[PDB]
């Protein structure tokens, strides 16, 4: 036996806080989470504990150690198929990734409706509160490859694949409300123009090059989405706490025939946050996997990802009330005009077993409707329709993706179609073909009906030419970014600035930037100036006179569309670091602790090395990581406690952590003599906003920092934060 | 017309420094780069200007901008072949990475011999030294995917495609002269364990987890390559200042038949250089590229990437004259013992065209051998032979994966392997078989002869019973990780030292950390003790008293394994952040600029925002890049001129812009009131070694400045950094 006498080498099976224990496959981990779909994949599961060591004809292995060989110091023969069968399989582990979203973290889990849709959609999902649909999330990037960073500026995917009774819905989202191009035939175009240029392969997982900018400046139709992705928007602090949305407008139609129309919204009920860039870019190197480790250690804590399923619904005989088309990807529909009606909830309660099996092969497209929903004439839902049944053909070997074990209905499905690349199912149909009468024609067709019945198209008028044209009332570009600009606070103004003016400077064609400037020009003039500015370029005469673009029907701003004007703040599944010194006060820290618990805030106990620390009272103190090896990027707030403040006082890696936490808004708290670590972030000896201190850590010292925290960052520190060399 | 009318679009054709013009592709970069391969690949370079937009069908395509719709606002047609034939291909981009190695960076070269080697080789491009043979060199990582960070831990794969005369031949080797694992059939094994775990897929492009460690406490033969990883030999400057070995002993076989045993080496002539860990994990969030970047930019500058071929040869006679077997993987012939002799040079002289044609479809695989060669029977090696060949069906499609351009052999290849995918020859002959009369016999069977003769293998003897068993001579483990730890610098040591406790800090089960820091005991207990003190652990009684492993042959140290012991610094190439101010003395700059020039080291301009600024002579000194846009870990040395150094005094950035590089140990020269700066960085006002300083920027300041650049970081400045928060 190799495994510790002690059994430490396996992982508690019950919720465990990050860190505190390895983490593990989901039904290991979590064996008592069930839904309907984890335990229809219970044929394919597959164990290993007392079992024999085999080929995979069945065939026990002796020596797994060696190759056969003439004479222990031999060729090896060719005779030897234990070596060639484990070699090959090997050899050829790897499928070809996504071409967008390549970079992407999955779980399990379930949604319920609040209420019965029935009125307004015959989808079964939807028709009882009681019914409850088992679900498989991917979060994602969209640039990078399956081996880039998680913390990089991009928009981000929310796919959920919903396995009804009626079929499977594929809900294919992104987490701004609009897209950068208005038709799919552009897809390859801009994809091509955000990714890596085609003679170096360079950059991974960034916008900042020229191909991207060129497109964007000769593109206006891409500005809107621009302005989301040079937002906050563009690095969230978890998938936890970003929005999603179906961008398109789809159709709900209850069981009379009614459309509506409807665009998706998914909320996050841990709230809206987002890191700041430096902290982002610095992060894909400390951390590349830091969304995916995040989401994984949510669930195993119990701290599951909830989402509420909403939707902004327009009937039919409004579909021209607004300034914009409501077909057009580019144009979000304000939360002010329409609000969002709130549907269900979603919760992520399950890890993976194997991220490869379920994960990288789960196949979701949006074409993957169930009766009581439909599509629109969206000229970039329409060409998506196309290409996610396409794209499945070589990613997933073949047309029988769907009968690998994620992607596989839990409702019946049955029908003539045959064959193909690792066929599994053998059907033992007489016909494979209707109509038929050797099998009396089944499985039959069904008439569309309120429930259970055939998908029917709904009647839409079509009327026009064959015409490869955009519609004139899409070829408005400006207005939109306007609204989502005036809609942002100030400090996050200034963070969409530093986003195009960071970006901008990496663009080698400086007439690239200018180009840009421009097209900022059209949209905001102080927004261009600022731009402007951090580039060098002065705006012309011409430009300072650009009158500024229509607001959205009479609306001069829509809050809903910042992440920070209304505070929806949850600290519940944050996590804090707790510099440790060599003689901690067990008083300021047992205090720390019980307030964190309270809140279900999480902590980490650093120092600068490995192993235990005893507190002044003779309580060993168990450290989680080094300064260096969990850097303040991680948390979201730092506490230092009372002790020999003398053992880290002038360790530079300590120093250091509270300089880059002070520097990226994250609330800090120090205790006693931890408040000698002032003078190293300058604070002055009065104080301020979002440093929280006292004599020791409690009456209120928890409360203050605790609040600081549901307030996510200091944002009335950002003129402060410049001076500071970090 | 979109272009500039400057043309400013478009980078000069002709070497140009790295920042100077946009990047291009390499045949539009450097037009007169030939050889006989770039030449041969004419036939299937596309060009762009002038030509039509068309279909793949070479149909002309009026709007490329638009599906074919019904109505402008209407549904998508599926009789659009111009939008599907463009999604499709879309759809299909990607291909299967690389099991391993799927992070690698690619360019054009070629290799001469210096003199002829036929005394002990028949191989055709190593008869005389004026046959120039075409090369295709891929470096890479190990672990990571296509999309990992460059800069990470790992070691590099340094891959050459020889196009010779009488076949390719592809030397496949690493920057470490050993490999982990000494039987192919543990590969799987060994590269499951270092790879993302299986459950969530993480950590990307780290050894630094549970699973790794889990296989090297349990398999000690893979302590020596863990050594060279662990020390800074993981993480070069660049693929340009790294050793490469081809770590088998193969053999060469001269027209006479008599085999030498050889073991491959590439020197570097642009020396060893390494990061340090702090400066090269920041380095993967700040330019994922790096190493991409560097090497593309090096091309483009003319500072080409040259190599030493190196042979160490052993006669056969000489086989078991060793205390270690020749044939295992996981020991190296050290330099003292059997020198390397200095056989060629390769330049690699033009960047690709198309990374994905060019680099990503590239099939490198050691059994492509060519007569004048031949194996040994290394168990790793020969298990090799299997999986370079059958890895390609998945990976390139098929069989005929040598019709891939890049692949193709410059020399005659005739035979009668006929079909398979993709298949492009059009085989004329009458005949697919022989021996035929239809053709008589043609392409016929060659003998082997001195040369242009048909490949026979060396007909060495054979005998022992067929086993799956370990040689007893490879059964030793710890000798050759002693003799790499004794042959380092102090300070290599300490970074090795610092590396295992990095990386075990980050292994969740402790007993893992225990077990390791235990084969470490029997390593060198100072490195043991150093490596335990870190993680918290105290060496036992025992521990302390394991004998050391004997030397090598009577060997205590070997300075060739050291990367800095033998000073070998070549500044050509290297890059010098110079901070500017709106002011800068013109005098300063006019002399660093001619100074760097001279020894072919670049600069780049830096300063708090793009666009230029003004000296005060009234010269415009244009800005590459901002302080945070390109941070001190992408630059050699930094160097600050006098001017208005009121003007970047208080800026944080610009502060921790010295900061940085001063904790990575980079020289640092300035001017002048530049001196203010030495207060950021606590430097006495009589200097220290590694800052240079003086009233302006004279003729000794640069030299002294160029001196330290040649000793690649300043060593003696490690203890003062662990003061500094940075
Ligand atoms: C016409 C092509 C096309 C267009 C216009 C779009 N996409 Fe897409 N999308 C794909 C073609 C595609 C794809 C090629 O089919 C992918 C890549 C691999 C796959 O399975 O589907 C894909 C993957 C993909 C994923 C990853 C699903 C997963 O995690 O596996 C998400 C979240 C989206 N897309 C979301 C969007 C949104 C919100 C869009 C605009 C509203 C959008 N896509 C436009
Ligand atoms: C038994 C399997 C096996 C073993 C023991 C090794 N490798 Fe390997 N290697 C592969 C199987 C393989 C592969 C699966 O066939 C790869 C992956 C993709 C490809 O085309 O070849 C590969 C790729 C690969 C590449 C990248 C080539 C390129 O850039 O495309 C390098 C540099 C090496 N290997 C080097 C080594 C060295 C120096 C080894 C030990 C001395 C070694 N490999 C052991």
Same mark, same amino acid.
């Given at each position: 036996?190799?495994?510790?006498?002690?059994?430490?080498?396996?992982?508690?099976?019950?919720? &465990?806080?990050?860190?505190?224990?390895?983490?593990?496959?989901?039904?290991?981990?979590?064996?008592?989470?069930?839904?309907?779909?984890?335990?229809?994949?219970?044929?394919?599961?597959?164990?290993?504990?007392?079992?024999?060591?085999?080929?995979?004809?069945?065939?026990?292995?002796?020596?797994?150690?060696?190759?056969?060989?003439?004479?222990?110091?031999?060729?090896?023969?060719?005779?030897?198929?234990?070596?060639?069968?484990?070699?090959?399989?090997?050899?050829?582990?790897?499928?070809?990734?996504?071409?967008?979203?390549?970079?992407?973290?999955?779980?399990?889990?379930?949604?319920?409706?609040?209420?019965?849709?029935?009125?307004?959609?015959?989808?079964?999902?939807?028709?009882?509160?009681?019914?409850?649909?088992?679900?498989?999330?991917?979060?994602?990037?969209?640039?990078?490859?399956?081996?880039?960073?998680?913390?990089?500026?991009?928009? $981000?995917?929310?796919?959920?694949?919903?396995? &009804?009774?009626?079929?499977?819905?594929?809900?294919?989202?992104?987490? &701004?409300?609009?897209?950068?191009?208005?038709?799919?035939?552009?897809?390859?175009?801009?994809?091509?123009?955000?990714?890596?240029?085609?003679?170096?392969?360079?950059?991974?997982?960034?916008?900042?090059?020229?191909?991207?900018?060129?497109?964007?400046?000769?593109?206006?139709?891409?500005?809107?989405?621009?302005?989301?992705? *040079?937002?906050?928007?563009?690095?969230?602090?978890?998938?936890?706490?970003?929005?999603?949305?179906?961008?398109?407008?789809?159709?709900?139609?209850?069981?009379?025939?009614?459309?509506?129309?409807?665009?998706?919204?998914?909320?996050?009920?841990?709230?809206?946050?987002?890191?700041?860039?430096?902290?982002?870019?610095?992060?894909?190197?400390?951390?590349?996997?830091?969304?995916?480790?995040?989401?994984?250690?949510?669930?195993?804590?119990?701290?599951?990802?909830?989402?509420?399923?909403?939707?902004?619904?327009?009937?039919?005989?409004?579909?021209?009330?607004?300034?914009?088309?409501?077909?057009?990807?580019?144009?979000?529909?304000?939360?002010?005009?329409?609000?969002?009606?709130?549907?269900?909830?979603?919760?992520?309660?399950?890890?993976?077993?194997?991220?490869?099996?379920?994960?990288?092969?789960?196949?979701?497209?949006?074409?993957?409707?169930?009766?009581?929903?439909?599509?629109?004439?969206?000229?970039?839902?329409?060409?998506?329709?196309?290409?996610?049944?396409?794209?499945?053909?070589?990613?997933?070997?073949?047309?029988?993706?769907?009968?690998?074990?994620?992607?596989?209905?839990?409702?019946?499905?049955?029908?003539?179609? $045959?064959?193909?690349?690792?066929?599994?199912?053998?059907?033992?149909?007489?016909?494979?073909?209707?109509?038929?009468?050797?099998?009396?024609?089944?499985?039959?067709?069904?008439?569309?009906?309120?429930?259970?019945?055939?998908?029917?198209?709904?009647?839409?008028?079509?009327?026009?030419?064959?015409?490869?044209?955009?519609?004139?009332?899409?070829?408005?570009?400006?207005?939109?970014?306007?609204?989502?600009?005036?809609?942002?606070?100030?400090?996050?103004?200034?963070?969409?600035?530093?986003?195009?003016?960071?970006?901008?400077?990496?663009?080698?064609?400086?007439?690239?930037?200018?180009?840009?400037?421009?097209?900022?020009?059209?949209?905001?003039?102080?927004?261009?100036?600022?731009?402007?500015?951090?580039?060098?370029?002065?705006?012309?005469?011409?430009?300072?006179?650009?009158?500024?673009?229509?607001?959205?029907?009479?609306?001069?701003?829509?809050?809903?569309?910042?992440?920070?004007?209304?505070?929806?703040?949850?600290?519940?599944? $944050?996590?804090?670091?707790?510099?440790?010194?060599?003689?901690?006060?067990?008083?300021?820290?047992?205090?720390?602790?019980?307030?964190?618990?309270?809140?279900?805030?999480?902590?980490?106990?650093?120092?600068? $090395?490995?192993?235990?620390?005893?507190?002044?009272?003779?309580?060993?103190?168990?450290?989680?990581?080094?300064?260096?090896?969990?850097?303040?990027?991680?948390?979201?707030?730092?506490?230092?406690?009372?002790?020999?403040?003398?053992?880290?006082?002038?360790?530079?890696?300590?120093?250091?952590?509270?300089?880059?936490?002070?520097?990226?808004?994250?609330?800090?708290?120090?205790?006693?003599?931890?408040?000698?670590?002032?003078?190293?972030?300058?604070?002055?000896?009065?104080?301020?906003?979002?440093?929280?201190?006292?004599?020791?850590?409690?009456?209120?010292?928890?409360?203050?920092?605790?609040?600081? *925290?549901?307030?996510?960052?200091?944002?009335?520190?950002?003129?402060?934060?410049?001076?500071?060399?970090?």
């Amino acid at each position: 036996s190799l495994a510790p006498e002690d059994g430490s080498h396996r992982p508690a099976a019950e919720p &465990t806080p990050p860190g505190a224990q390895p983490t593990a496959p989901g039904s290991l981990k979590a064996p008592d989470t069930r839904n309907e779909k984890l335990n229809s994949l219970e044929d394919v599961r597959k164990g290993s504990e007392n079992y024999a060591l085999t080929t995979n004809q069945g065939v026990r292995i002796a020596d797994d150690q060696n190759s056969l060989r003439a004479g222990s110091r031999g060729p090896t023969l060719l005779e030897d198929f234990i070596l060639r069968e484990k070699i090959t399989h090997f050899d050829h582990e790897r499928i070809p990734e996504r071409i967008v979203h390549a970079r992407g973290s999955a779980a399990h889990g379930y949604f319920q409706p609040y209420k019965s849709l029935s009125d307004i959609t015959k989808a079964d999902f939807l028709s009882d509160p009681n019914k409850i649909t088992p679900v498989f999330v991917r979060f994602s990037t969209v640039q990078g490859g399956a081996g880039s960073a998680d913390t990089v500026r991009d928009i $981000r995917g929310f796919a959920t694949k919903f396995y &009804t009774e009626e079929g499977i819905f594929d809900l294919v989202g992104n987490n &701004t409300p609009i897209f950068f191009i208005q038709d799919a035939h552009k897809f390859p175009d801009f994809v091509h123009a955000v990714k890596p240029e085609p003679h170096w392969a360079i950059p991974q997982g960034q916008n900042a090059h020229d191909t991207f900018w060129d497109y964007v400046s000769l593109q206006p139709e891409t500005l809107h989405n621009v302005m989301w992705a *040079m937002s906050d928007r563009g690095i969230p602090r978890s998938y936890r706490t970003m929005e999603g949305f179906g961008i398109h407008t789809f159709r709900l139609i209850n069981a009379e025939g009614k459309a509506t129309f409807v665009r998706f919204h998914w909320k996050p009920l841990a709230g809206k946050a987002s890191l700041v860039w430096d902290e982002a870019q610095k992060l894909t190197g400390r951390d590349p996997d830091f969304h995916r480790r995040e989401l994984w250690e949510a669930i195993e804590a119990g701290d599951f990802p909830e989402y509420e399923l909403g939707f902004q619904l327009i009937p039919e005989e409004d579909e021209f009330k607004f300034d914009f088309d409501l077909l057009d990807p580019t144009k979000l529909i304000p939360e002010e005009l329409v609000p969002v009606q709130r549907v269900g909830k979603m919760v992520l309660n399950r890890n993976p077993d194997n991220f490869f099996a379920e994960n990288e092969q789960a196949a979701f497209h949006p074409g993957h409707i169930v009766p009581g929903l439909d599509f629109t004439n969206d000229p970039l839902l329409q060409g998506r329709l196309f290409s996610y049944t396409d794209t499945q053909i070589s990613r997933l070997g073949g047309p029988n993706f769907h009968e690998i074990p994620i992607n596989r209905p839990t409702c019946p499905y049955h029908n003539f179609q $045959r064959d193909g690349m690792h066929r599994m199912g053998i059907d033992t149909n007489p016909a494979n073909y209707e109509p038929n009468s050797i099998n009396d024609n089944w499985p039959r067709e069904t008439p569309p009906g309120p429930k259970r019945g055939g998908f029917e198209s709904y009647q839409e008028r079509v009327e026009g030419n064959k015409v490869r044209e955009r519609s004139p009332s899409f070829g408005e570009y400006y207005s939109h970014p306007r609204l989502f600009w005036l809609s942002q606070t100030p400090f996050e103004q200034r963070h969409i600035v530093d986003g195009f003016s960071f970006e901008l400077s990496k663009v080698v064609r400086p007439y690239i930037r200018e180009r840009v400037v421009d097209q900022l020009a059209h949209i905001d003039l102080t927004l261009a100036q600022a731009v402007a500015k951090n580039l060098g370029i002065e705006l012309t005469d011409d430009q300072l006179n650009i009158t500024p673009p229509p607001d959205v029907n009479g609306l001069k701003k829509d809050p809903s569309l910042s992440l920070y004007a209304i505070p929806d703040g949850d600290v519940k599944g $944050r996590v804090v670091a707790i510099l440790l010194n060599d003689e901690v006060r067990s008083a300021d820290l047992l205090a720390i602790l019980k307030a964190l618990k309270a809140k279900g805030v999480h902590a980490k106990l650093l120092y600068s $090395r490995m192993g235990e620390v005893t507190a002044d009272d003779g309580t060993v103190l168990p450290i989680a990581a080094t300064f260096a090896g969990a850097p303040s990027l991680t948390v979201d707030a730092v506490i230092v406690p009372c002790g020999n403040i003398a053992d880290i006082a002038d360790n530079g890696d300590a120093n250091y952590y509270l300089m880059e936490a002070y520097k990226h808004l994250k609330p800090i708290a120090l205790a006693g003599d931890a408040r000698k670590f002032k003078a190293t972030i300058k604070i002055a000896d009065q104080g301020e906003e979002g440093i929280v201190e006292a004599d020791s850590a409690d009456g209120s010292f928890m409360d203050e920092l605790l609040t600081l *925290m549901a307030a996510h960052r200091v944002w009335s520190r950002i003129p402060k934060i410049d001076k500071i060399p970090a």
